[PDB]
UniProtKB/Swiss-Prot annotation:
Homology family: Belongs to the metallothionein superfamily. Type 1 family.
The keyword Acetylation is annotated on this UniProt entry: yes
Positions with a binding annotation for a divalent metal cation 4: C3, C4, C14, C18
Binding-site positions, a divalent metal cation 5: C4, C6, C7, C20
GO cellular component, as recorded: astrocyte end-foot; axon; cytosol; dendritic spine; extracellular space; inclusion body; microtubule; mitochondrial outer membrane
Lineage, top ranks: Eukaryota, Metazoa, Chordata, Craniata, Vertebrata
Record protein name field: Metallothionein-3
Keyword tags: Acetylation, Copper, Metal-binding, Metal-thiolate cluster, Phosphoprotein, Zinc
Length: 37
């Protein structure tokens, strides 16, 4: 699943376990993040 607001369901960055799973300062609402990019 997209598992994110900053990533789609294809983010292979999240294909391991959602690299941004940390809902701390890596807010997904952002619509996009800066770890997978
Ligand atoms: Cd994300
Ligand atoms: Cd991601
Ligand atoms: Cd994710
Ligand atoms: Cd990310």
């Amino acid at each position: 699943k997209s598992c994110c607001s900053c990533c789609p369901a294809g983010c292979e960055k999240c294909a391991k376990d959602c690299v941004c799973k940390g809902e701390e300062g890596a807010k997904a609402e952002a619509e996009k993040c800066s770890c997978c990019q």
